[PDB]
Amino acid sequence: GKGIKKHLKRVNAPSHWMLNKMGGQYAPKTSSGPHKLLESIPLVILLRNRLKYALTFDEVKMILIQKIVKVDNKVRTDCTFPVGLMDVIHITKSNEYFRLLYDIKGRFVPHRITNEESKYKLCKVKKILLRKGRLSIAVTHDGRSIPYIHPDVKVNDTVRLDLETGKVLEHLKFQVGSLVMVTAGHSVGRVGVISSIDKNMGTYDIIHVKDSRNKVFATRLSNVFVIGDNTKPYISLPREKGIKLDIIEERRNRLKA
Amino acid sequence: RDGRHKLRLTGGKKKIHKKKRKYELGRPPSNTKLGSRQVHVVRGRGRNYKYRAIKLDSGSFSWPTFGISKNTRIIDVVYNASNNELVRTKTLVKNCIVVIDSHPFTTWYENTFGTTIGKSKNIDPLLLEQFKQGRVLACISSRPGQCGKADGYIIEGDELLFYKRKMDKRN
Amino acid sequence: DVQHERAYQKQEGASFFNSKRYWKKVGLGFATPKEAKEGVYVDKKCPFTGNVSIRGRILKGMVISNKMKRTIIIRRNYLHYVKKYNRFEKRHKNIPCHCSPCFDVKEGDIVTVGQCRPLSKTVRFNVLHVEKHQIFGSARKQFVLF
RNA sequence: AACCUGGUUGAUCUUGCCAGUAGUCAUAUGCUUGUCUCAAAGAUUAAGCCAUGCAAGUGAAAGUAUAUAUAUAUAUAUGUAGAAACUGCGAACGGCUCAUUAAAACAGUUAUAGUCUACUUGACAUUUAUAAGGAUAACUACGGAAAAGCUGUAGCUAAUACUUGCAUUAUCCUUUUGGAUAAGUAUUUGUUAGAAGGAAUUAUAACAAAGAAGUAACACGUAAAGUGUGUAUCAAUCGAGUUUCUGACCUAUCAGCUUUUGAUGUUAGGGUAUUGGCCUAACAUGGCUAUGACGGGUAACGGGGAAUUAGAGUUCGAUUCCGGAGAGGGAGCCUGAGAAAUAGCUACCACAUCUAAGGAAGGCAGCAGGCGCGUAAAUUACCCAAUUCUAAAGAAGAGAGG
RNA sequence: AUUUCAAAGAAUCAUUCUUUUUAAAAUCCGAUUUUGUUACUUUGAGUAAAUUAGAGUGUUCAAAGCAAACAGUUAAAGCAUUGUGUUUGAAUACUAUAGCAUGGAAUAACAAAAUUGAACAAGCUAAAAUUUUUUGUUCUUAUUUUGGCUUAGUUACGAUU
RNA sequence: GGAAAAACCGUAAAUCCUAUCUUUUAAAGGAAGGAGAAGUCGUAACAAGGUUUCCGUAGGUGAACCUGCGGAAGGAUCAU
RNA sequence: AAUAGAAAAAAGUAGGUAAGGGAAGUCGGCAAAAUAGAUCCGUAACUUCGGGAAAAGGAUUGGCUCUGAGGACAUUAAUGU
Structure with a gap:
């Protein structure tokens, strides 16, 4: 016939899966679900290839049957389920909580998080729709639907979201003084303050972002994730704090240990 | 069927490969005539259901000027914009001119305002003259071949004048 | 005046019986x-x-x-x-384009067109702005660098 | 390593070729071959033909068991297994070839305010009931036909298969509250009113008509109140179709092509999932062309890329990935979210197997293996452990794959 | 061919690189900031991996791979409030000329360009805004102010060799 | 409510007839080009090659060629 | 009309028509037959470029019931005959 393609070659899979050349022929194909294929990881990769609690896909299946993994406060059950851009992985046997974040090279690391901050997540809204009876709803990059959102919150504003009720605690404006995290552009995996906004009719919109070392780079509006307000990042950043060393310096640092 | 296997923009005869795909469709055309309501269900791609009315007679007709509708039997097909064949054969199609039995509207007006919402817009004499003789000229608006019913509106003013002149120099 | 092709021509969505073309x-x-x-x-x-x-x-x-x-x-x-x-x-390409009654367009005029949903087999732009400009010889042989 | 030599003559210097030299993920072949790692391999010739075997199924709390087997407590209670079968979901992916095909397909680049979208995800629904209607399989009995994944009767009986169908909430006023009134999701029509996008005939709100479809008569036992399965609308998602722009080999001993048989446009329809000559009718008389149209050739699938390169380049790309195309040649169809599907189907032509001759069954460019073609190519191997996929998803399957 | 030439300061070794100011209009509170199109060019953005160039890494060496390293005859050490091995790596670039954004002085094009075309000040005129408002569920009217248009004046008024 | 069966448009396989194009390929006889030998007949060209050569052209001839007409020097003269 | 009636055979002569074959008949396709009107398509070698040409070779054609196309006038665009 000519249906949907269900297979995925290991070579054809995203580079940031970080799989080798010689390990079989087919990758896990992510199931359909709350984050885009190219913009996630399948849970198998997280358990086996990153954390190393399984050496085989089979061990991942054995782990998954046991209801000891929870993503987003709820138990999950399919191996190929997506990890998502911002979420909380909870491994209940050893009492470990991870929040998923980007490094500074462009791949996902599971980052050790305290029990207290584990009970919330950060959700970018992609759209806001007006549904019957004049009740607004917001639509998230986390695949999740938000009923009864503030009219004060607009499309690029992010929102802090509880995991027990699924309701909003507060929100972070996309104002030109807010911390932004880069999600998929060439300079993916950085944090900066938002210098400047440029609006182009009918076409892509670019935002100029400044690093803590005062380096500047530009990036496309589509992939920009608000991550706090000028006081602090609202979730705990991983080790390099979103700050990218330049290659020469990085190699110089590596040697000088 | 759809979208290829006809000549190049230059006038050239473009080659063919890619054997006809199902998603082209080009489903067989339906006439639909004036009789007793009879409709067939059609299963369209992706499980879109459509309704094939093959005969009809009873529509939803709207008096646009007062924004109100009544259901009425449709007396005859009298003019078609496109080919004369459809009107001759007594077959309905979207933009066709039929005649409706005006007793519902007449009854409504008498009940509501009196005499044979946004009140008192005062009819039109030409339309009124038609109205006394009890069967009134209307344009079907909905698509019978898609929607399984034929729904329309009473013609008015300038549009009315145009259809009257074309329909009936004059042979 | 306007219409005389054999169907009524209406300017749909104009509205006629309430409001305040x-x-x-x-x-x-x-x-x-x-x-x-x-x-x-x-x-x-x-x-x-x-x-x-x-x-x-x-x-x-x-x-x-x-x-x-x-x-x-x-x-x-x-x-x-x-x-x-x-x-x-030099190479070149022809784009067949819908017009409007609004402009009055003469051979060799410069025009600014936009892209839109397909309106005929090869009519896939429609004119947005008429930049009037006289030309010499024949436009088919002419070269403008825009 | 940005390199040159021998050959016109009696001797000479040029021009000029031929000859040498090296490489070639580029084939063949001759001789020889001790090791070890690594590993291409019936593409060029015949998209030629195929014997035999294998290559897609699926039930570990959770639709259906008086076939049958079984463990505890007192014929009864619970349960536990369960051949068989209906039903469900997949089998529309994979894998293989490269014949077709030169603005086609393809690559980057748009658009979808022109649309469809199962599984999965998150929001979350409206005009007899202490529990409803049959009829059917397996199964039983009698059978038929040389033979086929042939199936005839008649008697049974279930289902998350098929089929019915049971309240109650919301609006306005005195003023926590006391009264009155409303009450169809898509979809489609007519009428208007008008959180966002560059731009709305958009989201949306009202009025008047029609209106699908639904909102549990289903299964477990979960938390020291839960799960499965089905389900309307929206969004998300895995995607798909169209679709903008720009990019190609050789040929002028192919120069005018295209328009009755849609060519180019306008209007109106029909049709589509949707736009459109996509298709019908009526009307225009255009559209393309030496900046190479229209033809012809290609021992031409495109690209990522490959070989050779000092720098330009030149040749190559069946072949690991992506995309396209096709399943002997053409054509037409069913089902379903997804197919003009080929280990779905119907027919023709070209081939061709079994037959007691009445009829029946067929498609290796899946993997093996055979014949033929040839310059030219491997085992009828072992295994589902890994890699992954499909399932009612651990535990089963997979010549996908190793 | 031609339409904006230059001048001053600091760094550095004698040169080099860098900054300041110098016409005119509009605009903003005597000071503050905007000014043809396009090619071209610069940065950027957004780019599948394998391949390829390439950083890291003693596969026994190499072809390679994408890993690994460290301490410990079995514990120290660290840090967790009697428990827990620790550091990690999988960079970078390229990914047409076309398309997208972007700084630009030169170089090119092109636009604008006199059997004539302006720019402003004055006055009249028809459109809009502002203030008022006739009359027992609602129909009017009236002054003023702003953009468009008809008509004398006034400017370094207007054409490179 | 509904199986068989038919008719009509519409897809439209396939079969046959022409028509053109394409591709090799047969054929008496004709007429070329090359390759091979020591064969025949000449003496055309190279020297003023024993009539300067060569061109264009036309006619003739046994062939090499000869001749007319008009050119050229790559001529045998750069020059009273 | 330089005759009539009746009969109905050979033969004659002016005619028809023939299964299956399709020029085998004959010096010889002679005779006979086939074709043909029109509209719409399609039309070669070769050519003194004028032709060849109706070339060749196709298709269609009734009756009925409709539809469209094509004028002339005269009222003060529309309205009429």
Whole structure:
């Protein structure tokens, strides 16, 4: 016939899966679900290839049957389920909580998080729709639907979201003084303050972002994730704090240990 | 069927490969005539259901000027914009001119305002003259071949004048 | 006046029995022409009063032919870089484009067209702005560098 | 490593070729071959033909068991297994070839305000009931036909298969509250009113008509109140179709092509999932062309890329990935979210197997293996452990794959 | 061919690189900031991996791979409030000329360009805004102010060799 | 409510007839080009090659060629 | 009309028509037959470029019931005959 393609070659899979050349022929194909294929990881990769609690896909299946993994406060059950851009992985046997974040090279690391901050997540809204009876709803990059959102919150504003009720605690404006995290552009995996906004009719919109070392780079509006307000990042950043060393310096640092 | 296997923009005869795909469709055309309501269900791609009315007679007709509708039997097909064949054969199609039995509207007006919402817009004499003789000229608006019913509106003013002149120099 | 093709012509979405004609704003920094707006004409593929709308690319071209009902043929001339010789050569492409009754377009006029949903087999742009400009010789042989 | 030599003559210097030299993820072949790692391999010739075997199924809390087997407590209670079968979901992916095909397909680049979208995700629904209607399989009995994944009767009986169908909430006023009134999701029509996008005939709100479809008569036992399965609308998602722009080999001993048989446009329809000559009718008389149209050739699938390169380049790309195309040649169809599907189907032509001659069954460019073609190419191997996929998803399957 | 030439300061080794100011209009509170199109060019953005160039890494060496390293005859050490091995690596670039955004002085094009075309000040005129408002569920009217248009004046008024 | 069966448009396989194009390929006889030998007949060209050569052209001839007409020097003269 | 009636055979002569074959008949396709009107398509070698040409070779054609196309006048665009 000519249906949907269900297979995925290991070579054809995203580079940031970080799989080798010689390990079989087919990758896990992510199931359909709350984050885009190219913009996630399948849970198998997280358990086996990153954390190393399984050496085989089979061990991942054995782990998954046991209801000891929870993503987003709820138990999950399919191996190929997506990890998502911002979420909380909870491994209940050893009492470990991870929040998923980007490094500074462009791949996902599971980052050790305290029990207290584990009970919330950060959700970018992609759209806001007006549904019957004049009740607004917001639509998230986390695949999740938000009923009864503030009219004060607009499309690029992010929102802090509880995991027990699924309701909003507060929100972070996309104002030109807010911390932004880069999600998929060439300079993916950085944090900066938002210098400047440029609006182009009918076409892509670019935002100029400044690093803590005062380096500047530009990036496309589509992939920009608000991550706090000028006081602090609202979730705990991983080790390099979103700050990218330049290659020469990085190699110089590596040697000088 | 759809979208290829006809000549190049230059006038050239473009080659063919890619054997006809199902998603082209080009489903067989339906006439639909004036009789007793009879409709067939059609299963369209992706499980879109459509309704094939093959005969009809009873529509939803709207008096646009007062924004109100009544259901009425449709007396005859009298003019078609496109080919004369459809009107001759007594077959309905979207933009066709039929005649409706005006007793519902007449009854409504008498009940509501009196005499044979946004009140008192005062009819039109030409339309009124038609109205006394009890069967009134209307344009079907909905698509019978898609929607399984034929729904329309009473013609008015300038549009009315145009259809009257074309329909009936004059042979 | 306007209509005499064998179906009534209406300007749908104008409305007639309540309110207090019809035209739209087109955007992208273009200006809705006065001659479109206070003109009386009826159309369906006109970008200032049809159901059609502009989205996609915006290009400038030269009009070659005016001789179909409301439809024009524009040539885009351009310079093609040839890697072997570090040099250019002229090449060109015709885009058949819908017009409007609003403009009055003469062979050799410059026009700014926009992309839109397919309106005929090869009619896939529609004119947004008429930049008037006299030409010498024949437009088919002419070269403008836009 | 940005390299040159021998050959016109009696001797000479040029021009000029031929000859040498090296490489070639580029084939063949001759001789020889001790090791070890690594590993291409019936593409060029015949998209030629195929014997035999294998290559897609699926039930570990959770639709259906008086076939049958079984463990505890007192014929009864619970349960536990369960051949068989209906039903469900997949089998529309994979894998293989490269014949077709030169603005086609393809690559980057748009658009979808022109649309469809199962599984999965998150929001979350409206005009007899202490529990409803049959009829059917397996199964039983009698059978038929040389033979086929042939199936005839008649008697049974279930289902998350098929089929019915049961309240109650919301609006306005005195003023926590006391009264009155409303009450169809898509979809489609007519009428108007008008959180966002560059731009709305958009989201949306009202009025008057029609209106699908639904909102549990289903299964477990979960938290020291839960799960499965089905389900309307929206969004998300895995995607798909169209679609903008720009990019190609050789040929002028192919120069005018295209328009009755849609060519180019306008209007109106029909059709589509949707736009459109996509298709019908009526009307225009256009559209393309030496900046090479229209033809012809290609021992031409495209690209990522490959070989050779000092720098330009030149040749190559069946072949690991992506995309396209096709399943002997053409054509037409069913089902379903997804197919013009080929280990779905119907027919023709070209081939061709079994037959007691009445009829029946067929498609290796899946993997093996055979014949033929040839310059030219491997085992009828072992295994589902890994890699992954499909399932009622651990536990089963997979010549996908190792 | 031609339409904006230059001048001053600091760094550095004698040169080099860098900054300041110098016409005119509009605009903003005597001071503050905007000004043809396009090619071209610069940065950027957004780019599948394998391949390829390439950083890291003693596969026994190499072809390679994408890993690994460290301490410990079995514990120290660290840090967790009697428990827990620790550091990690999988960079970078390229990914047409076309398309997208972007700084630009030169070089090119092109636009604008006198059997004539302006720019402003004055006055009249028709459109809009502002203030008022006739009359027992609502129909009017009236002054003023702003953009468009008809008509004398006034400017370094207007054309490179 | 509904199986068989038919008719009509519409897809439209396939079969046959022409028509053109394409591709090799047969054929008496004709007429070329090359390759091979020591064969015949000449003496055309190279020297003023024993009539300067060569061109264009036309006619003739046994062939090499000869001749007319008009050119050229790559001529045998750069020059009273 | 330089006759009539009746009969009805050979033969004659002016005619028809023949299964299956299709020029085998004959010096010889002679005779006979086939074709043909029109509209719409399609039309070669070769050619003194004028032709060849109706070439060749196709298709269609009734009756009925409709539809469209094509004028002339005269009222003060529309309205009429």
